[PDB]
Symmetry: D2
Subunit: 485 residues, 4 copies
């Protein structure tokens, strides 16, 4: 099975890079550097910083993008309802294996935390937890066991294993009945902002059921109905309910570290593998959020261990990689994005599509909807004609997504009148936007001009020469195989 080689990998078919903006990269000029290095999506991290701060980024991103004549997606990454620790006096708190320590629901200790007594923001912890229970902190790396109630606000605990933990970390309480909301009050206000400022997508945190996804859309409301929702799978319950979450969302974001208590470290790879196959079949994008290339926060060149780490992530099927602190607070923002790009390009080698397409087709429920039947059939035509680019006229972009789903061995070029659609398509691998100005240009029930606009593009990008074939779609339902002029 598969006798691969090491040669082509053309410029398209590379994975997509999401950059987290921070002090290192908020400037218009730094953002121009990011865009030029390979940024497709600017990610805002709403667990930190005021609305004024994020307002600035939105402005800067838009200005940088406009200056470079490109469309870059802005993404609101929510804080989420997950229970967190307070902050600590030092840079952190140092936990020791034998030690006993205290945990409080008293707001007084939120800004005062220490290795001996610190704060947890779940104001009802005392009522839910019982002596003998395990409190898992910081991706369940540090484990505490509850000994007794010191008072109606404080719990006596033992440190199960040595580990050093920093400010505001995730607390997990399995074996405790905790019905946390789908959306926190802070999320509710942040989502209003997102809607009002015209963001492209929400990276929803701590989703564990499909029902909770609907809650997020209900918060976004009628005005936010065109905003995509990408779901973070972070604990066991999310993994448990993935099937329902996938086909009820617009994508999935997963992180090797941040997968929760009940998945042991060694079976984390297994889950990554499964979740990627599960998304690839359903045709929705999977964002690899695990932080590789961490050394490049202080170093201009990475390590071959980190290179192989990204390679595997890519080679396995990830469509998007996401950079955190490296772009947000790191020393070499541009150099990081440039290596990602090269690795996302060069580590795509064996990625099959010829029989890979026919496998996804066999796994969809017949009878499929008319527009989906169109798109797959079109991909079919590409392999049959052995050529060579695709032109899709799509307003909401749904048709471009549907085609990508059936992974053709040629570039997909979407032609759109919605500027939002240009941006939102960044997180779809192997698809490129061509904006057609519905106002300034005008007429095209032809639909002459905008098709030619696609072919004009593909030609200039070096995809199609005179004599090549090109497959065209106008679905909601039309298909055409076109000889290049």
């Amino acid at each position: 099975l598969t006798l691969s080689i090491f040669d082509p990998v053309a410029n398209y078919r590379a994975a997509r890079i999401i950059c987290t903006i921070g002090p290192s990269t908020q400037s218009v000029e730094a953002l121009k550097g990011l865009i030029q290095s390979g940024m497709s999506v600017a990610r805002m991290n709403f667990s930190h910083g005021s609305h004024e701060y994020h307002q600035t980024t939105i402005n800067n991103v838009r200005q940088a993008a406009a200056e470079l004549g490109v469309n870059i997606a802005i993404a609101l990454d929510t804080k989420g309802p997950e229970i967190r620790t307070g902050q600590f006096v030092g840079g952190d708190a140092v936990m020791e294996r034998g030690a006993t320590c205290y945990v409080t629901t008293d707001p007084a200790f939120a800004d005062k935390g220490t290795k001996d007594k610190f704060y947890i923001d779940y104001q009802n912890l005392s009522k839910v937890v019982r002596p003998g229970n395990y409190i898992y902190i910081d991706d369940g790396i540090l484990i505490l066991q509850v000994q007794s109630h010191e008072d109606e606000q404080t719990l006596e605990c033992t440190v199960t294993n040595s580990h050093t933990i920093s400010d505001r970390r995730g607390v997990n309480l399995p074996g405790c009945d905790v019905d946390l909301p789908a959306v926190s009050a802070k999320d509710r206000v942040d989502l209003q902002f997102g809607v009002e400022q015209g963001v492209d997508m929400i990276f929803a945190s701590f989703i564990r059921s499909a029902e909770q996804v609907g809650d997020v859309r209900k918060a976004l409301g009628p005005k936010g109905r065109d905003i995509m929702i990408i779901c973070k799978i972070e604990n066991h319950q999310g993994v448990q309910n993935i099937d329902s979450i996938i086909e009820e969302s617009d994508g999935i974001m997963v992180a090797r570290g941040d997968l929760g208590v009940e998945i042991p470290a060694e079976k984390v790879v297994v889950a990554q593998k499964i979740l990627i196959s599960k998304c690839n079949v359903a045709g929705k994008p999977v964002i690899c959020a695990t932080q590789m290339l961490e050394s490049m926060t202080y170093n201009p060149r990475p390590t071959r261990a980190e290179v192989s780490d990204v390679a595997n992530a890519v080679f396995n099927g990830a469509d998007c990689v996401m950079l955190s602190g490296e772009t947000a607070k790191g020393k070499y923002p541009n150099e990081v994005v440039q290596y990602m790009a090269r690795i996302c390009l060069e580590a795509q080698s064996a990625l099959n599509e010829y029989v890979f397409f026919n496998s996804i087709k066999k796994l969809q429920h017949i009878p499929m909807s008319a527009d989906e039947a169109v798109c797959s059939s079109a991909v079919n035509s590409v392999y049959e004609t052995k050529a060579k680019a695709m032109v899709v006229l799509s307003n909401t972009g749904r048709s471009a997504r549907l085609v990508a789903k059936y992974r053709p061995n040629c570039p997909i070029v979407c032609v759109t009148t919605r500027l939002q659609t240009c941006r939102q398509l960044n997180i779809t691998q192997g698809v490129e936007s061509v904006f057609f100005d519905a106002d300034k240009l005008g007429h095209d029930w032809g639909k002459e001009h905008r098709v030619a606009a696609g072919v004009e593009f593909a030609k200039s990008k070096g995809y199609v020469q005179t004599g090549d074939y090109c497959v065209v779609i106008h679905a909601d339902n039309q298909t055409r195989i076109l000889l290049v002029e």
Copy 2:
């Protein structure tokens, strides 16, 4: 493999019936009876009857068809260059196993033939054959062996096996170098007639090489370029060169009896099977010319042995059955065609197409031509949408053929401005014509009206109700999945 049932088989998907016109059926009224019983094609047999006779049939067929408001194809079945015997004094000649007899190239004995001395129309036989050689007569059923030259015109022969033979029978001479023309002088004049009288297809006789097919088209000339050529495979050399003959012709006609010397009786089934698969893959029609239901030349009801004979022929994959003497000189012309119809319908049972289509697709040479890629992809869309009829706008009909090739599980409805195309489509299983009057109707670069004309038809024939899907093609290259109104 295949757990079949016995239930549906709707009206389409039945094989097509070709009727040989003769004294019993030349009348306009009898032809109306044939059309109503199930005739798709009137076949003229040019080995008999003057041009005046065949002129009459052509006229009658056209008048019968017009009166019933239908399009029936007229087919010229050539005599061919195969060497034949003379005629005999009795009804026949009775050959006896021990006997010695004489064979002449002297025209004097052509109308005088007898069991003891008869005529062969190969004026050069004496020069080619050597003592010890076998002369095979009447489908190689009677075998003679040459003993000596009696003179420069007559050969002394032994009867190898007892058999009774009638007038003008086929002579085969393997182990003798005989370069017979692709086309006889009589064929040359008959083909002019065919062209001048606007026939739909030639049933070319004794084709043994692809090169000979080109000779037939050269005879038909520029005016006859739209006339289809169906090739008769009758001897070993044809079977040997089938691959080349198939994809260089418009179809193949084969007869269990008439397959020649070098294929033993028991390995005749094997050949039938092979030739049918070979055509079905190349997408061209195969006409089963073997005469089943012979008893119905004198009887109103057939025998269950003959019923099972046709069944097998159909169930194996034949697209057309052909009736000879039963329609031409038989007592019950209508009743024969009616049983064929019922058997061609009811014996179609298990005929798969779901994975059968995907097998033919896998066997075509990539990269296929744009119009072929379109048609297969369209068939693909039918199964994906699970519905329900096809509308193809085709001028020469090539596109309808290409779709049939990929055997969809729905009826194909062709819309055409060429009246010739209506006729020529009779020999394609599962395809129906809708004539669109280019002159009287007029405008349709829309191409609004004629598409609706197809859907109008499919609706009335009971294929498509409100809510069903229908797949549409305008290839040479367009495809559309359409919701029924």
Copy 3:
């Protein structure tokens, strides 16, 4: 799918011939002629002739076989419980479409039957049937409709369609509640005889349920437990309950004619096809009892229509053909069996086994029994080693059957101490017996000698030369790949 050729077909892999003994062939000398022509099984037809008559055949068969030094199976073909007509004064009765006629349950008319009034042996017919019901006679070819009761013994009827019927024909009464026994009183006495005279197999008639098969074995009793039961499928109910009947019997016998009312003539082929696939998967033999080559009852040479008839029957997958009147009362008994043999040989051409074996393997229920797992695995080894004969040591022969089931591309040679097993293996295609005299020879827990006895045989029959591989089995569980000496 399948690009066949016309070349090999070695002597094994031919289908097996069953001959019906009658006046033409009861003599020891005629039976020697049959054996030499290709008879594997002598069939006795217990619907005719006294026990003394059948006693003679049994004796003659055994004497002929012993003289020629071979083992020929004797088969008791039961009369069965199906309702039959009486006999008629003439040679027959001539039924006419308009006519009215009378049917009696009065024994007085059993030997007196006529076109106007005749007898039916169901002594309760009057109580079961209602005016308007259809009586189907002679394979449902002649159809009557009941008009009224003439008396408590006679029914007034109309002839629905013209047909001529002879003595003692099958009556079918669907739409009438008739619980006929699994076994008639005459069957009960005949089966005792069968057991007492050491027959090899029963051809059980009119089986319509698996439960009825058990009734047949119950009649045969403890002494008859090694006698195989072959089930005749003759009506709709048998076809309905086939799955259960197949895996509860030792084989199936089917006849194109004799399939019953509810299967129309054209859908008879469909059933043949299904039943053959159904048996081939379950690995049990299917006997084609339909009478082809009927003309050879009076003629030394058959017709190419009959040749193609047998060809199809064979090419489709039949393992046994059965001759009736042709061997029993025909003019040319030997010549018939000789043509069958040649057709069964030469019409085997394309019969695949390479991927055909792997399809049957995929369709068996895992986990299979140890001995079955052994046999299939052994067949697997043959293809892997590309050689070349199989030696199976089997006492009851079960292991030889199991191997045949997985259709290897080499001859199977069974070595057995049971002389009954030699005979019973005649109805298994591609398997040959080697008798090993347990008494006279003796020792072989080796199991040295008897394995060598198999290899000795295969070598002499021209299967294996020095250097070839040969696969050996002793299952109930052992397998060995052996280099030839």
Copy 4:
């Protein structure tokens, strides 16, 4: 494709651990700790240490193994002919991007090396290299460019990129004609030792052609004919000639780092993937030598990045992992081997074998040898019977290897009279040895006792209870499916 889960993974089917002995682990007691933690193979690294040192290890390993009553393989890992640097005055040499430096073939500088002038042991370097050429040092991480000859012994060079390098590192010279021997003089003497001291396998270094493998065996000679040769693929030429090297060796060892110049860092994963599939098909073991878990040289607990690193390595198909400095000179030798074991166990999850076996079978050249045909067929029997352990009687162990090749879903238990075979089987995944004392026990042409010895084992290890099936082999050719008592 593949809807995995996270549950079973029983104790067998885990990958195998190879430990490099050094100061931390040479003691008998430390070796007992290694064996108990999961060591299957002690690896000696002959690029360091005198023969006396390695003599000690051999003794200690054997004593530790005997005390624990187990068989542990000893492996000689050769130094190899690859060109190396000298050593440096400091701990290392620090190379700087702009700098110019000098390289000498003068032995005087071998023990004196510095960042400005150091030594290379290729005494002919001056004659081969030309100005402008690139010298690649330390896995081609540091790159130099030749400027000129300073003298007949020294080259002037520029440092292409900053990197710090330590003692005696690998030098690669592509674009230079260097015919290095297959075996160095030091290798020649070391291989004599290996033979004389009864090692189990050689880990041959710097093999780039199949022809060179034969040279290694020629060095080992008649006495060393039972010693397995595992080939290190370290440069492009090895990768180029892999097909020939694989089926001409006894295994392959590969290291993510140590793959050479011409494979860029990002396309290293691609090669790993290919080489593992290539070995798995040919059925030979692949040793992953890349150093994961490096942090555990100084830390008791690893990092989840290293855990995921091993996971991928395992999950991809590696049969053996190899530990270097961690066991040789590390602080926590036991704890390292214990984590490997847990990761090699728990990260095996999805590893399919049901259809995975049938894919390897389809890719072997028919006709296969009798003994190979036996083994695959036996594996076939396991799935068919759904049970449950395998017992293989094998003298050289070849048969156990052949069975493993066809990856059964049950444990394989080999029974052997050769104590060397016990050891050598450690590097085969999923196979376990049972030693049968040919001298002390004695008789078994039965072959009763030793089969029972296998079943005795499987029962005690908890594989087989009363009622389970067990498949048995004595190939060179016998197979048996056995019910457990």
